[PDB]
Amino acid sequence: MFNRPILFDIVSRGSTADLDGLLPFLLTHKKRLTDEEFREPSTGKTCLPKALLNLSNGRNDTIPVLLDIAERTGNMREFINSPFRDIYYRGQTALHIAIERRCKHYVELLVAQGADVHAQARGRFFQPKDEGGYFYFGELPLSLAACTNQPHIVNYLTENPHKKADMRRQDSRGNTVLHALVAIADNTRENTKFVTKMYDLLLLKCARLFPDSNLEAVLNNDGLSPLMMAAKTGKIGIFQHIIRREVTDE
Numbered sequence: 476m477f478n479r480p481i482l483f484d485i486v487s488r489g490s491t492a493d494l495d496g497l498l499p500f501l502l503t504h505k506k507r508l509t510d511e512e513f514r515e516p517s518t519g520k521t522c523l524p525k526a527l528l529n530l531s532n533g534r535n536d537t538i539p540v541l542l543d544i545a546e547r548t549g550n551m552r553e554f555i556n557s558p559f560r561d562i563y564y565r566g567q568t569a570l571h572i573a574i575e576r577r578c579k580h581y582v583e584l585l586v587a588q589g590a591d592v593h594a595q596a597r598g599r600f601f602q603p604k605d606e607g608g609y610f611y612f613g614e615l616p617l618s619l620a621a622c623t624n625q626p627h628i629v630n631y632l633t634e635n636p637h638k639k640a641d642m643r644r645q646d647s648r649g650n651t652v653l654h655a656l657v658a659i660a661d662n663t664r665e666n667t668k669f670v671t672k673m674y675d676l677l678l679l680k681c682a683r684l685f686p687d688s689n690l691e692a693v694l695n696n697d698g699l700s701p702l703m704m705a706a707k708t709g710k711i712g713i714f715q716h717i718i719r720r721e722v723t724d725e
Contacts (some may be wrong), residue, residue, distance in 0.1 A: 477496070477497055477501075479512060479513055479514075481691050483515075484556075486526035486529065486535070486537040487526070488529070489526070489530075489535045490537070494537065494540055500513040500547050500644065504586060506681075507548050508541070508545045508548065508552050508554055509521070509523060509545070509550060510550050513605070514557070515559070518546075518561060519558055519560060520559040521569075522537075523538075523542075523554065523555065523557070523569045524559055524630050525569075527569060527573060527581065528572065528576075528580070530576065532577075535654050538581065539584070542555070542584070542588055543670050546588075552589045552676035554586055555568075555570075555590050555591075559639050561608075562597065563605075564597065564598060564609070565597050565599055566594065567590065568596070569585055570582065570585050570592070570594060571616060571619065574625065576619055577625060579627055581626055582630060583635075586632070586638055587635075588631055592639070592640040593615055593616075593617075593640065593644055594615065595646055596614050596615075596619070610659075612655060612658075613646050613650060613651075613652055613654070613655030613658075614646035614647055615634060615640070615646055615652075617629065617644065617652050618651075619649075621655060621673050622655050622656065624673065629673070632679075641683075642677060642681045642684070642690060643681070645688060648695055649693075649697075650695050651693050652677055653690060654695055654699075656673055656700050659706070660710045661710075662710070662711055662712050662715040667712035667713065670712075671716040674716070675720070714723045
């Protein structure tokens with residue numbers, strides 16, 4: 476006997492033992508971890524997210540097993556990419572939680588099994604009495620990593636051999652990852668320090684991977700390059716840094 480309430484209890488606790496039988500049960504009953512009855516009616520959280528939120532010393536051994544079972548029984552991409560909503564975001568995915576939980580190990584795993592690397596997490600039109608569980612970060616995992624000051628993950632997302640994230644990708648606002656970086660720059664020392672690093676890290680990177688395309692030149696939907704956007708929004712620290720570079724380049 477398996478179903479939502481049970482299966483979710485089981486991964487919530489991280490018990491591999493309490494999975495024995497899931498594979499046979501699924502097959503013999505013609506059922507799949509992608510099916511609607513294994514999705515939270517409200518959100519869309521498959522058991523994947525559910526196990527990803529209940530890590531412990533940052534691991535949860537149901538994960539590998541679950542991925543495997545979903546591979547054997549059904550469409551594994553469909554599984555990994557299945558999207559969920561909370562009050563603050565819609566279109567969130569396993570990959571997203573992996574990054575917000577600052578967990579190199581499972582990002583690698585998901586990316587390796589076929590995670591959509593360009594999944595956009597979009598904001599919801601919320602209240603006042605709900606405000607503060609949202610922040611705009613680009614919409615994509617790459618932007619997410621960049622913004623939350625996670626170099627080692629940005630590298631992996633761009634340098635892995637399974638699926639590389641396009642640096643030139645623009646979100647729903649037309650914003651690439653540099654725009655994102657602009658968006659989150661406040662003017663604090665600690666902030667400006669990591670942000671410029673991140674910017675420089677990515678621009679230079681995009682130079683080698685694509686030499687005759689300019690990243691800095693991609694205009695968002697308001698028609699702005701990042702630098703323009705920094706000027707237009709009082710992001711002095713980064714605006715300054717950006718200039719100092721363009722020039723210093725001979």
